Structure formats: C-alpha cells, structure tokens
C-alpha cells in the first residue's frame, strides 16, 4: 500500500512525491499564502491603531520563495498552514497546558485519619458526598463560613471542580457519580483491574483550579489554591472550629504529605515553581495522555499520541516560549505529529519486531538494540532519499533526527518491553544518521546525543535514572528541542506493547480520565486540528466582564 505520508505529500506539492526537481521564486512570496496575507493586513491595522510599526513583510528576508506548505495533522484529514499549529494561534494547545497546570491530585487518606483520631468523628460515603458538594461550591472561589465575603463569578470559573477516585468499588459506586472518576467505566477490564489494585482503598481527589487563575498566576498556585478550599470545605463539612490546631494537619496533608504535583520545581538558572512544564517527568506526560485507555489494541497509536502531546508541550510552549520565545519552535514539534511520517516509520518497526521476535519477547540487551534500532533507522532515512518531497517537507536536520530516532527507540522498546533499551536505540539511531548523511541537527542538537549512550545505563548521582523518571530537568536534556516529547513516546512504547495500564504513576493516569476536562486527552492530535481550524472553545476568557 502507499506509505502513510503519500496523501499528505500529494496535497502539498503539484509534483508526485518521487519527483526530484521543481520550480521556485514564482509564487509571489508571502502572497501565495492565505495566512500570511491575513497577517500582513492585520499588521497594518495594528500599527495604525497603536502608532508603532509592527508586522511588515518587507522587513528582513522575503518569505515564500518556495511553497509554504500545508500540514496534515496525523490521524486526521485536517490540512492547515503551520502558523495554525503555533501555540499562540491555537487555543487547543494553550488549553492542553492550562488543564495540566491547573490540576493537582490530593489524597483524602491522611485527612480522613485526622478526622477519626484527632477530632474523634466518623467518615463515611455520606460525609464524603456532603464534603464534595461543599468543595465544589468552594473550589472555584466561593465562601462557606465567614460573613461579608466577596466571591468569584461562577461563569468565569465554570471549569474548576473536584472529583474523586478509589480502588474500592463499593465507595466509588455509592458517591454521586457527578463527583467520581469511575475506573470501571473509563478503562477496559484488565487495565481497570490493575489501576484499582494500585489505588486499593485509598481515596484521591483530582482538583482543577480555574483556567483564568492559572493564566493570571502560575503553576505553583495550583496546590495552594486547592489546599485553601479543601481546608475550608473540611471545616464546613466536618464541623471543626474554623481554625483550631487540627486545621493545620489538613493544610500540611493537602499541601505536602499527600499531594501529587504534575511537575516539581526547577533549579535557579531556570527558576520556576511546581506545575511548570520542565518539572513534568516523561512517565507522567505519557500517563496524562489518555490514548492508552482508548487505543490499547494499537501500541503505535498510543505511543505516537504521547509523542504529539509531549512534542507540542515541551518544544513549543516550554522550550519555545518559557525557555526562549519569539517565533519559536512550531515545526521542530509538528515534524512529530503531522503528515503521518513518524506513523509510517513506527508502524514499519512494530511490524519488523512483531514478525521477528513477537512484541516484548526480544532479549532485553544490546544485541536487540543494535538489530532493531539500526533496521528502523535505515528504513526512515531511505524514505527521505526515495521521496524528495518528504525531505523538502521535513527540511531541518533536527526534525528528521527526532522522527527517525523516535521510531527506532519506540520499536526497540516494543521488542524488549523495557524503556531503557528503547533509549539506547534512540542514541544509536542518531550516531548512524550522523554518519549516513554527514549531518544531524542544529548546531547544539546532539549535546545529549553524544553524552547519550554513556548515560543510558549509568548509575551515578546526576546521570543514572530509568527513562520514565527523567524529564526536561534531567541535566543533559535541559536545553534542546527535538528530544523531550519523543522520550515521552519511548517511555510509553514498552508499556503500550505490554498492555500496562500506566507508565509511571497510576494516580496521574486516572486523574485525566475525565470528560469534564476542557481538552479531550483521549484524542490529542484531533484536538490540535480542531484548535488549528479555530473550532476549539477554551476556558479562561474575560468576555463576560469586558464590553461588547
């Protein structure tokens, strides 16, 4: 059958994708593009309104001496110019980050113990449901005890709420389903079984603070906001004095002893608090993406939906804005989630491993890394040599390095069932690619790539870590595009091939299994297309409190 990227190449260019030559310089520059023409007109209107020149196509070099291409969002039939995939222009991408930044997981197990032991009061399904009605009024910013409080406008904070989950079916089934993430409904049977056994009789809150607050403030606000309103709703729902010594144990439990942040805080050169992108480990990003509970019959689809989630968040918003900014890094990430290119290469490697070894039945060793990562690396590179349109599409070396090595590393992990040999496959792909074409990525792309092989299996203090625990603050990975989202895909790959319900943290997996999120985490690439088309409705807007 056609390679998976043929339809997209046929849409982009008038030539068949195998053709070697083309024509340039006759498209009228920026005038070939609907989107660039929109921007030129908007620049003139902005500059006149404010009295300061702004966007001007005649500053600097003239864009569009070649085709400015549309991109197919992979797994969709949506084609858009790449500006529609820039996070500033795509409200689905901004909302995906807001839904992660504004979420925290907070146990009720210490809290219910403080109630029984210190206060001498009982906790039951009844008292939990009453507490949940109380906290769903309080959490968005409304009062439960004092007179003359002033409150947030409910419609500005309609995305904030608190749900619970537990492995105990008979508590879960008895609470108002309005408040419960129901594991048996959300997950297929064998994954539900695994997840309920990890959670056991623990009961955990999933708290989402308002998007308008997260945008005004930062990620480190989320667990503090969550604890203030858990603290008020424990006082109101359990009849404490409104501020006695025991109140402080609910605060310490909600803020420290039973909180799970999405990201941990960062060192001073890149100072940031919790719940910022750099603190989110790759195993948690794979568990936030919800493809694993929908697409479990297809491990490639699960792994590549996690690559799309992480390429966008870690390269476009994190490295391309928090850590840099400007025009930024749209297409270093779009390479990993458009035109079905990574899909073609990864389906090839999955087929190679399934036929030769059987999924997860290769030896977990260097022989398997050498076999699978080299075979898949040469397949991907050969496609850029056999289809000149594919090479002109993924024009930057870094984009091709990340796509070919993500398919080699994911396939290696589909063989071994272990992420660390998948990671060794990723670095071997880079070294083969660099020799094959006498180039790899941008000037600084393979810092981590050359430290890579030696640090895959090291055990030393700031070097050794299983891939699932690494993240954007792992030292070698702290700066450069074209790696982090792909490492989240490699972390997902052996667990998708094994059928595991989660990669690194079962609480995180269950906490995003919820259709009351604004972004649909089961279909991340579908949602990126919807935002590109200007069809996604984000939370957090101020239209209700600004003039018509």
């Amino acid at each position: 059958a056609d390679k998976l990227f043929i339809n997209a190449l046929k849409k982009k260019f008038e030539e068949s994708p195998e053709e070697k030559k083309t024509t340039f310089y006759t498209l009228g520059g920026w005038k070939q593009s609907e989107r660039k023409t929109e921007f030129v007109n908007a620049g003139k209107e902005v500059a006149a309104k404010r009295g300061i020149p702004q966007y001007n196509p005649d500053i600097g070099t003239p864009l569009g001496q070649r085709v400015l291409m549309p991109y197919q969002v992979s797994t969709t039939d949506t084609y858009v110019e790449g500006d529609d995939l820039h996070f500033v222009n795509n409200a689905a991408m901004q909302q995906m980050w807001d839904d992660i930044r504004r979420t925290v997981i907070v146990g009720l197990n210490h809290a219910h113990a403080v109630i029984e032991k210190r206060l001498g009061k009982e906790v039951t399904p009844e008292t939990i449901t009453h507490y949940l009605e109380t906290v769903n009024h309080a959490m968005p910013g409304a009062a439960v005890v004092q007179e003359h409080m002033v409150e947030t406008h409910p419609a500005l904070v309609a995305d904030s709420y608190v749900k619970v989950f537990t492995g105990n079916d008979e508590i879960a089934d008895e609470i108002d389903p309005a408040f419960v993430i129901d594991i048996n409904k959300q997950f297929p049977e064998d994954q539900a079984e695994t997840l309920k056994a990890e959670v056991g009789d623990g009961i955990w809150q999933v708290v989402r603070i308002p998007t308008i607050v997260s945008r005004t403030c930062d990620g480190a606000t989320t667990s503090r906001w969550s604890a203030m309103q858990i603290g008020m709703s424990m006082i109101s729902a359990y009849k404490q004095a409104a501020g006695e010594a025991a109140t402080g144990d609910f605060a310490y439990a909600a803020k420290h002893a039973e909180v799970i942040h999405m990201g941990t805080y960062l060192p001073v050169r890149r100072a940031r608090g919790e719940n910022e992108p750099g603190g989110v480990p790759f195993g948690y990003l794979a568990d936030i993406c919800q493809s694993s509970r929908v697409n479990y019959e297809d491990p490639v689809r699960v792994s590549l939906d996690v690559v799309a989630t992480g390429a966008m968040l870690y390269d476009q918003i994190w490295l391309g804005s928090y850590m840099s900014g400007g025009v930024g890094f749209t297409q270093y990430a779009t390479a990993a989630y458009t035109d079905n290119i990574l899909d073609d290469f990864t389906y090839f490697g999955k087929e190679y491993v399934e036929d030769k070894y059987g999924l997860c039945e290769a030896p977990n060793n260097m022989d398997t890394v050498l076999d699978v990562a080299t075979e898949v690396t040469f397949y991907g590179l050969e496609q850029y040599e056999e289809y000149p349109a594919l090479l002109e599409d993924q024009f930057g070396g870094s984009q091709r390095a990340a796509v070919v090595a993500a398919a080699a590393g994911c396939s290696t992990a589909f063989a071994t069932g272990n992420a660390q040999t998948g990671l060794s496959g990723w670095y071997l792909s880079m070294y083969l690619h660099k020799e094959q074409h006498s180039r790899l990525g941008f000037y600084g792309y393979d810092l981590q790539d050359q430290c890579g092989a030696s640090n895959v299996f090291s055990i030393r203090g700031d070097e050794g870590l299983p891939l699932e625990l690494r993240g954007p603050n792992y030292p070698n990975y702290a700066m450069n595009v074209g790696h982090q989202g792909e490492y989240a895909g490699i972390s997902q790959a052996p667990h998708a091939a094994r059928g595991d319900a989660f990669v690194f943290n079962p609480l995180v997996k269950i906490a995003f299994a919820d259709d009351n999120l604004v972004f649909d985490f089961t279909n991340v690439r579908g949602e990126f297309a919807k935002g590109a088309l200007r069809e996604f409705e984000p939370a957090g807007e101020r239209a209700l409190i600004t003039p018509a």
Binding site: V114, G243, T247, T264, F457, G461, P466, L469, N505
Partner: protein
C-alpha cells in the same frame, strides 16, 4: 578571654558538673564537642536497606505512588547486608584507619553511615555525605548480585529517587538530618533546616537534651550567618548557655518551682524576681503603683528572659503533655513580660513575632502544620535568631501522643540511626564536659 562572664554547668538531673566555666568555653568557635556534633551531623546518613529491597521488588521508585511495571528486581539485600555494608564501607572510607563508620541495625534492615570527616575538609559543603553514601551502596548492591547494565539504573532509582529530574532526592531510601543546599532560605542557613521532630527523635524525647541539641544547632547557625560576630556575639553565647545549656540551673530551678501548679505567668514572676536578686535588672523609675525596670546589661537580661521562656514552655506544654500551645507560650511569655517590667522581651520582640506567625500557621488553613514539622529554616520560624525553635523541640519532647505528624510518623528512620550516636543523643553531657576541659585555655 574577650568576655569576663562565667557560668556554672549542670547535668540533665540538675546536679552541678562544673563551676565557673568561662562563657567562651561554650562557644561553637571553641568548644570541641560542638565541633564534633556539627561535623557529625554533616557526615551521618541513615540507609534503609529493607526500603531499597522492597522498592526494587515492587518497582515502586521515584516518589509517592510511582511504579514502573516490568522493572521489578528481586534481590536478597537484607539477607546479604553484612557483605554489602562492608563493600560500601571500602568505597566510603579514605583510608583503613580513618573515622568512617558503617554499622548494621535492625538485623541488617538499616545501616548507620558516618562518612569520613576528611572528605568534608576538602569539600565546599555537606552533600558528599548522602552522595558518597548513595553511590557506595548502589555499587555494592550491583556488585553483590552482579546486577546487569540493563537493570542497574533501577537500583540507583531505589536508593536516591527521582534526582536529578527532581532537585531533591525524591523517593530516596536514605535520610539525613540536613536537607539539600538549594532549600536554604539564605546563605548560612543549613544547620537551621533540621526538622524539630528529627531533633526530638535523635534525643529519645529527653526534654533537656532535645532543647540542648536544638540550641546548639540554632546558635551554631548564628555564627555561620554572621549574626554572632562583633556587637552581638555575647548575646548569642549567653542565649546558648542560659536557654539551651541550663546555665546556673536557671531553667531547671524555674521548672522545679512551677511544675506542680504553675503557669506561664508564675514562671514570669519568678524570673523577674531572680533577675532583680542577681542585679541583672533594677528599678529605674516609679510610675503610679508601677515600677519601671532598667538594665545596664541587655545581653544578660535577654539570656535570663530566654531561660524563663524555656522554663515556661516546659511548664505550660509539660502540664498539657500536648505540644501545640508552645506557639502561645512563645507569644504571651514575651508579651506579658514587657508589660510586667518595661523591658524588651526575648530577642527584642523577635521571639514574640515568630510566635504570632507560628501560632497562625499551626492553627489555620494556609500552611505550616503541627510544631514538629517546623525548623529554623522554615519561613514561619526563621525570624528569631535561635531563641524560639529550641522551645518547640522541648514541647514536642513533652507531647504524649496528640500529633498526627509526630516524630514516630516523620522521623522513624532518623530515630533508629541517629539516636545511636552518643553526642547526638546526649549532647548536654558532651558539651559541658568539653567546656570544663578547655576552661583554662580561654
């Protein structure tokens, strides 16, 4: 001597040990037992061998609720503890006859490690203790079982946690009484970021020993922060002596006099009487039916009021056998004494201010927690320069079981290991003995 003051020193039963010790023989800059305590706390690590084995067998590494399915490794670490600890020790030591100590506890489930002092004399700070310990145990467990290159990264995760993706050793199965240098609220604060429950666990809940270890650590930090340099040095040394070392048996005799029926208020009355009796204060002015006291020695007035404040905590929270009201004692002992006398309270109002915010953050929704989770580096309790936290340690020594976040909950691994060390567990004894020993060199 730079100062002429002498103090009499006692044991924790109120018996005299040594008379007329120059004040500087208790200085952290001079006293060799304070040096040994401080170097001890820098270099000691507790290793949870059982915890490492269990994290490996379940693949539960990297922090709360984390697990990597398929990564389980079942290794008989506790059954081979002696071999693993000896192999770790050969990598931890510098030479065969240095001061490295590696000692199994709990049938091999725990190890006490003391990294050789010399590694610190060529180090900028104190992180060599957990980092040298951790790698020596990770390498000794890999070598014991011949763990493969493909699996060994799980042993590193089980020992040191999610570091370096996290800044802290998140999920580690080692522990120290210090915390990482990035968590200091200012330069010079590391001897202050030591949880009050760890001080109370190390000293086995002995009230006077918990107060003496906490004061030694807080006032030694005051030197490292420069607070005890020049004009302020004598104030800090007299605080150490009178509030934390029971100088002159002042704290002990106030508690004896007010233990049966006493309140914070009765302790205040006895302390003001004692200060007048000793010439520390005198009446300056008569108002209408009210004497205004003055002093010609603010550092000594401050030390006597500090000894009263410790005694008041021991009376008040000792009577309740519940530590929570130490925040109130720290507040109102100071507030009452200023209106009782016309003189400034302990640390010129800074104990009283620390106690206002400590009271709020131990009885409110906004942060803090129970007394035992505070420390001299915590934002709520860093403000007084050594005169508040030792009272919190005495109060948690006296708690009979009212806390959810008690030393048994937060500090069990530290208790097992660090209470083994005689100078951590009974510091009052060793610092008095050393002070008597160097008394003629001041």
């Amino acid at each position: 001597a730079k100062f002429e003051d002498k103090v009499d020193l006692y044991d924790d039963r109120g018996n005299l040990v040594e008379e007329q010790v120059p004040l500087e023989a208790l200085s952290p800059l001079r006293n060799p037992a304070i040096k040994s305590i401080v170097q001890g706390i820098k270099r000691t690590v507790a290793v949870n061998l059982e915890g490492i084995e269990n994290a490996l067998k379940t693949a539960k590494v990297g922090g709360p609720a984390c697990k990597i399915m398929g990564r389980e490794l079942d290794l008989d670490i506790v059954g081979n503890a002696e071999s693993i600890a000896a192999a770790a020790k050969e990598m931890i030591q510098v030479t065969e006859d240095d001061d490295t100590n590696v000692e199994l506890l709990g049938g091999g489930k725990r190890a006490l490690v003391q990294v050789p002092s010399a590694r610190f004399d060529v180090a900028a700070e104190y992180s060599a203790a957990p980092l040298v310990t951790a790698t020596a145990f990770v390498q000794a467990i890999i070598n014991e079982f011949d763990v493969s290159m493909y699996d060994a990264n799980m042993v590193k995760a089980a020992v040191l946690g999610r570091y370096p993706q996290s800044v802290e050793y998140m999920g580690a199965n080692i522990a120290t009484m210090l915390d990482i240098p990035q968590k200091l609220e200012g330069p010079g604060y590391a001897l202050r970021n030591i949880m009050v429950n760890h001080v109370v666990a190390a000293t086995l809940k002995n009230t006077l020993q918990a107060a003496a270890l906490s004061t030694i650590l807080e006032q030694t930090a005051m030197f490292e922060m420069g607070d005890a340099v020049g004009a302020f040095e004598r104030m800090h040394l007299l605080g150490l002596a009178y509030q934390g070392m029971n100088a002159d048996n002042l704290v002990f005799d106030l508690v004896k006099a007010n233990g049966k029926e006493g309140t914070v208020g009765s302790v205040i009355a006895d302390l003001v009487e004692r200060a007048l009796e000793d010439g520390v204060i005198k009446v300056e002015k008569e108002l209408t039916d009210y004497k205004v006291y003055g002093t010609d020695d603010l550092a000594m007035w401050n030390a006597y009021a500090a000894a009263g404040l410790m005694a008041a905590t021991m009376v008040n929270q000792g009577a309740a056998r519940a530590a929570q009201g130490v925040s109130s004692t720290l507040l109102y002992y100071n507030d009452l004494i200023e209106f009782e006398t016309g003189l400034p309270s302990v640390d010129f109002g800074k104990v009283e201010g620390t106690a206002v915010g400590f009271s709020f953050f131990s009885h409110s929704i906004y942060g803090g927690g129970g007394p035992g989770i505070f420390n001299g580096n915590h934002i709520v309790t860093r403000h007084s320069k050594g005169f508040a936290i030792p009272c919190v340690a005495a109060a948690m020594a006296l708690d009979a079981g009212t806390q959810m976040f008690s030393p048994e909950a937060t500090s069990g691994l530290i208790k097992e290991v660090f209470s083994q060390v005689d100078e951590f567990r009974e510091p009052l004894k060793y610092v008095v003995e050393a002070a008597a020993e160097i008394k003629n060199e001041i």
